[PDB]
Design brief:
monomer; about 400 residues; mainly beta; Jelly Rolls; Trefoil (Acidic Fibroblast Growth Factor, subunit A); 13-stranded antiparallel beta sheet; 33 strands; elongated
C-alpha cells in the first residue's frame, strides 16, 4: 500500500514505490559506512532531503487514512540549549495544513493540521534520567497511523505508545513536498540518523506494524546496543540485561581465574539534562571469526565464533574446561587454550531475542548459554543449560559519538 519508500542506491536515495518521487539531496547529507541506508542529517543549511511527490498522491482529504514509518536514532541531549526547543525534522505542511514530525528534548511529536485552524499532536516522551535507556541514541522504529474517524496513533518498536482523537479535523491538504531538515533547532551540534522512510495510504494495524518492524530490522543479523549491526573485531563493553547495574570484570587471567559481574555501575550527569549509568565499564569482548567463508564483518544468527576478552588492553580467549554442571568462564591466554571449550554460536533468534552466546565443547556437545551464577557473594560468568528465560541475554556496547561518555 507503500506510496513512498526511500532507500539507498549508488550513493543516492531513490523511491522504490511505483510513483517515483523526485528526491533532491543537499550537500551536507551523509551515509553510514556499514549500512548505507542510515542517513545522517546535521544542523547545517544544506543538510536536506526534499522529496517532491507527484501531484496524484498528494494528500488532500477529509476521510482518507494514511500512515508513516521510519527508523530514527537521536543522540543524547547534552546541553541547556536543548531544553524547550521543539524543532521540525520532517515537514509536509502547505500554509497551515498537513503533517509534520518534530523533535524536542526527550520527545518525538506528530502534528496534524487541517485548513480551519484545528491541530492535533501526538507525543512520544522518553526520559534522560534513567539508568539504562531503551531509546537514547538507540535506533527506534517509529510508526504513526491516522484513521480520520478515530485517532492518530504513535508506535515505537511496534508497540502503541499514545494516541489522540482527530475526528475534529476537517480537510487536510498536505504539501507536495516532504522536507527532511532540522528546522528551528538552536543547537548547532545536533544531528539525527534516519532509515527507511515510508508512507502508506491506509491506517496500518498492529499486526502489519509488527511485521514491518520485524522485516526492516534484519532479523538474521545480530545488533549492538545502539541497534547497528554487530561486527567482528570490534571491542564491546558488556551489559547483562537480567542484572543491568553490573559490568563484567576478570578475577585473574588463566583457567584458575574467572570472569564475573561486579557493580554498581557509575553515573554520568548534567543537571536538569541527563542522569544515566556509565556504559563504558569493564572487560570488553571482541567477536572473532571461526568459520570459513563469512567474508564480510557482520555477525549473523548462527555464526560460529570465538569470543576474546580484553584485560589491560590485551586480548584473551573466553573459555572453560572440557569435562554436566554449569561451567565457570575464564580468560585464557590464546596460545594456552588447547582443547578447552571455546566455540560460541551467536544467536539473534530462537522468534527474535537479544544476543545470546551458546557455547560448545571441542567434541561439539552443547554446554549451554553464557550467563551468570551466584556463588555466595560473587556472580560468576558461566555456561549453563539452565537457560531454557532472560539471564543469558546480553548487549554489546561500542563507543558511540551519540552517547558522549568518556572512553
Amino acid at each position: 500500500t507503500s506510496i513512498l519508500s526511500i532507500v539507498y542506491k549508488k550513493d543516492d536515495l531513490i523511491d522504490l514505490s511505483r510513483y517515483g518521487a523526485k528526491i533532491n539531496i543537499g550537500d551536507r547529507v551523509y551515509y553510514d559506512s556499514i549500512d548505507k541506508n542510515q542517513i545522517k542529517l546535521i544542523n547545517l543549511e544544506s543538510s536536506t532531503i526534499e522529496v517532491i511527490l507527484k501531484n496524484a498522491i498528494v494528500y488532500n482529504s477529509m476521510y482518507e487514512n494514511f500512515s508513516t514509518s521510519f527508523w530514527i536514532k537521536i543522540p543524547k541531549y547534552f546541553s541547556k540549549i536543548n531544553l524547550n526547543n521543539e524543532y521540525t525534522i520532517i515537514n509536509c505542511i502547505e500554509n497551515n495544513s498537513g503533517w509534520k514530525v518534530s523533535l524536542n528534548y526527550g520527545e518525538i511529536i506528530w502534528t496534524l493540521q487541517d485548513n480551519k485552524q484545528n491541530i492535533q499532536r501526538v507525543v512520544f516522551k522518553y526520559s534522560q534520567m534513567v539508568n539504562i535507556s531503551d531509546y537514547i541514541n538507540r535506533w527506534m522504529f517509529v510508526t504513526i497511523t491516522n484513521n480520520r474517524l478515530t485517532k492518530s496513533k504513535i508506535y515505537i518498536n511496534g508497540r502503541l505508545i499514545d494516541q489522540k482523537p482527530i475526528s475534529n479535523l476537517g480537510n487536510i491538504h498536505a504539501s507536495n513536498k516532504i522536507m527532511f531538515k532540522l528546522d528551528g533547532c538552536r543547537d548547532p551540534r545536533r544531528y539525527i540518523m534516519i532509515k527507511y522512510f515510508n508512507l502508506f495510504d491506509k491506517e496500518l494495524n498492529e499486526k502489519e506494524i509488527k511485521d514491518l518492524y520485524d522485516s526492516q530490522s534484519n532479523p538474521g543479523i545480530l545488533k549492538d546496543f545502539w541497534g547497528n549491526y554487530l561486527q567482528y573485531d570490534k571491542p564491546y563493553y558488556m551489559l547483562n540485561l537480567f542484572d543491568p547495574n553490573k559490568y563484567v570484570d576478570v578475577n585473574n587471567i588463566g583457567i584458575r581465574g574467572y570472569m564475573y559481574l561486579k557493580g554498581p555501575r557509575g553515573s554520568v550527569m548534567t543537571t536538569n539534562i541527563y542522569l544515566n549509568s556509565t556504559l563504558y565499564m569493564g572487560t570488553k569482548f571482541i567477536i572473532k571469526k571461526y568459520a570459513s567463508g563469512n567474508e564480510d564483518n557482520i555477525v549473523r544468527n548462527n555464526d560460529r565464533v570465538y569470543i576474546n576478552v580484553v584485560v589491560k588492553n590485551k586480548e584473551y580467549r573466553l573459555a572453560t574446561n572440557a569435562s554436566g554442571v554449569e561451567k565457570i568462564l575464564s580468560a585464557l591466554e590464546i596460545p594456552d587454550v588447547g582443547n578447552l571449550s571455546q566455540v560460541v554460536v551467536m544467536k539473534s533468534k530462537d522468534i527474535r531475542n537479544k544476543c545470546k552466546m551458546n557455547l560448545q565443547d571441542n567434541n561439539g556437545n552443547d554446554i549451554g548459554f553464557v550467563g551468570f551464577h551466584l556463588y555466595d557473594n560473587i556472580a560468576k560468568l558461566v555456561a549453563s543449560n539452565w537457560y531454557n528465560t532472560f539471564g543469558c541475554s546480553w548487549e554489546f556496547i561500542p563507543v558511540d559519538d551519540g552517547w558522549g561518555e568518556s572512553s
